[PDB]
Amino acid sequence: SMEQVAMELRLTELTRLLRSVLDQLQDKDPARIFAQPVSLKEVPDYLDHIKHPMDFATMRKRLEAQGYKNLHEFEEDFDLIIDNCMKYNARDTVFYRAAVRLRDQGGVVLRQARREVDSIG
């Protein structure tokens, strides 16, 4: 149908916007601490601690399959990156600290993304 097409154009444009959001958030991680899945070879117990692992490469795979229906879904995944780290790693670690800085800096990008998603529909 023409409606299904219109819908798919909206999803494609959301994907366009979320791809830009993703690039902006990932720039706030210049150390690349969150770029890839935590290695289960290198942290073999990880899944005993963290039930839903997340990372920026995993988000990008989902993004490129148009797997985020709305900004809320995307933000859920971003928040998992941060919250997983802040639980697994102690407060005094470079990892925890990287997550705090990512959360704080990402807030700004996400605040305007939400306005853009609502604004453009």
Side-chain angles (χ1 to χ4, degrees), residues 1-2 4-6 8 11-15 17-40 42-60 62-68 70-110 112-119 121:
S1 73
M2 213 19 259
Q4 289 305 318
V5 172
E8 294 163 349
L11 175 54
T12 295
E13 284 309 308
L14 175 64
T15 305
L17 188 153
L18 295 183
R19 189 184 299 112
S20 174
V21 177
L22 184 63
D23 294 340
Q24 285 177 73
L25 295 174
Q26 190 152 26
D27 293 327
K28 310 312 174 149
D29 176 31
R32 299 191 73 85
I33 289 163
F34 307 103
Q36 290 296 327
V38 170
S39 177
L40 306 173
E42 303 172 357
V43 188
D45 75 354
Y46 187 68
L47 303 185
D48 295 346
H49 291 272
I50 297 301
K51 300 299 176 186
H52 297 98
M54 192 48 55
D55 66 275
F56 287 130
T58 302
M59 293 188 60
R60 196 175 294 280
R62 180 165 167 194
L63 177 66
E64 289 312 335
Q66 302 189 345
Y68 293 115
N70 55 55
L71 187 51
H72 180 77
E73 292 191 342
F74 179 96
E75 292 174 312
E76 285 196 327
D77 271 357
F78 179 63
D79 285 339
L80 276 175
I81 294 177
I82 298 313
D83 293 336
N84 290 344
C85 188
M86 292 174 73
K87 289 166 189 82
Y88 190 84
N89 302 107
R91 204 159 38 254
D92 72 327
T93 59
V94 65
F95 306 107
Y96 182 113
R97 288 163 176 284
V100 166
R101 292 165 60 84
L102 181 60
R103 190 197 57 186
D104 286 350
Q105 297 195 278
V108 181
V109 169
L110 291 170
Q112 204 57 39
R114 162 53 65 204
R115 292 191 66 79
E116 282 174 336
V117 164
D118 295 3
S119 187

